[PDB]
Amino acid sequence: FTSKDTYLSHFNPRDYLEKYYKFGSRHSAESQILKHLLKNLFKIFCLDGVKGDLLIDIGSGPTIYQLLSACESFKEIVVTDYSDQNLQELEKWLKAAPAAFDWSPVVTYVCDLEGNRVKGPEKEEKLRQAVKQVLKCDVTQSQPLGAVPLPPADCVLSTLCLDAACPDLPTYCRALRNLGSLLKPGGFLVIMDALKSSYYMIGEQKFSSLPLGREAVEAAVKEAGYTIEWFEVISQSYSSTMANNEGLFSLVARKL
Ligand SMILES: Nc1ncnc2c1ncn2[C@@H]1O[C@H](CSCC[C@H](N)C(=O)O)[C@@H](O)[C@H]1O
Ligand SMILES: CN1Cc2cccc3c2N(CC3)C1=N
């Protein structure tokens, strides 16, 4: 199973962004999936009452898509990833470097969902202002953020990280439990991940994925000290050239 070190040495941020996050007019398997992610995080952060002071984004990677709706609902967003190269691609965009991956097609989409109330530039600035901290992360450590002092967060968020980072269920259950120590009692856990997947490709590079189904995930969540507000499962898959998932699940949980 892909080790931590192989995320430091082989995970290619720009490569990954190109492969998965170039909102393309040709209706790819990747595009449709992004569209669906975007719609859930909208429903969760805008339509529903999931809001608060502090959100912690677990396993951010180089990507900002999952923070776009959340920035409407939280004052303070911290972003975390295990890999230094990854945090460096984020910061590019945070700094609005002209070398930063181009997100406007995604920003366009979200602004639409929220009924065009704002424009790309004013959506972007909101996120920029919202992100206070960019930190090293390890979901396997009982203190994932290590030393860094943080108040208890209202919400922990994780998109397609926990599958990537957890070799087994024991460890997967440990990770959730670790995230929970950053969360208030009654705090929000929002996870979105692949169902029944063993690998995913960034270019030529193959990264492991923990193949778990609907049941195992829900079980792991209860064990870690959470109750599930809601749990969703969609058929849509990635291109066969890229991963072997059967679908995706989204959930909102609450800590005890
Ligand atoms: N032990 C660990 N702790 C924290 N993050 C880890 C980790 N092992 C891997 N990761 C991170 O998990 C991410 C999986 S890729 C998903 C990135 C982003 N959330 C998205 O939706 O596309 C990578 O950025 C990798 O650095
Ligand atoms: C964006 N993808 C696509 C994907 C598909 C399947 C499995 C996994 C992924 N992961 C992590 C695990 C990603 N980061």
Numbering used by the authors: 5 to 260
Passage from the reporting paper:
Nicotinamide N-methyltransferase (NNMT) is a metabolic regulator that catalyzes the methylation of nicotinamide (Nam) using the co-factor S-adenosyl-L-methionine to form 1-methyl-nicotinamide (MNA). Besides regulating Nam availability as a substrate for NAD+ biosynthesis, NNMT activity also influences the SAM:SAH ratio, or cellular methylation potential, and regulates DNA and histone methylation, thus being an important node in the control of cellular metabolism and epigenetic regulation. The nicotinamide binding pocket of NNMT is an attractive target for small molecule inhibitors. Here we describe a novel series of tricyclic compounds that are potent and selective substrate-analog inhibitors of NNMT.
JBSNF-000028 inhibited the human NNMT (hNNMT), monkey NNMT (mkNNMT), and mouse NNMT (mNNMT) enzymatic activities with IC50 values of 0.033 µM, 0.19 µM and 0.21 µM, respectively. Thermal shift assay was performed to assess the binding of tricyclic compounds [(6) = JBSNF-000028, (8) = JBSNF-000107] to hNNMT prior to co-crystallization studies. Both the compounds were found to be tightly bound to human NNMT in presence of SAH (molar ratio of enzyme:SAH:compound ~ 1:5:10) with ~ 10 °C shift in melting temperature (Tm) whereas ~ 3 °C shift in Tm was noticed in the presence of SAM. Based on these results, crystallization was carried out with the hNNMT protein in the presence of JBSNF-000028 or JBSNF-000107 and SAH at molar ratio of enzyme:SAH:compound ~ 1:5:10. The asymmetric unit contained four identical copies of human NNMT molecules (named A, B, C and D) and overlaid within 0.4 Å RMSD among each chain. In the active site, demethylated cofactor, SAH is bound in the cradle formed by loops (141Cys-Asp-Val-Thr, 85Asp-Tyr-Ser, 63Gly-Ser-Gly, 163Thr-Leu-Cys, 69Tyr-Glu) originating from the Central domain. Tricyclic compound (JBSNF-000028 (Compound 6) or JBSNF-000107 (Compound 8)) is planar in nature and bound below hairpin structural motif at the nicotinamide pocket and stacks between Tyr-204 (from Hairpin) and Leu-164 (from central domain). NH-group attached to saturated 6-membered ring interacts with side chain of Tyr-20 (from N-terminal helix), main chain carbonyl of Leu-164 and very proximal (~ 3.2 Å) to S-atom of SAH. The overlay with hit compounds A or B shows that compound A lacks the hydrogen bond interactions with both the sidechain of Tyr-20 and the backbone carbonyl oxygen of Leu-164 whereas compound B does not form an H-bond to Tyr-20. This could explain the lower potencies compared to JBSNF-000028 or JBSNF-000107.
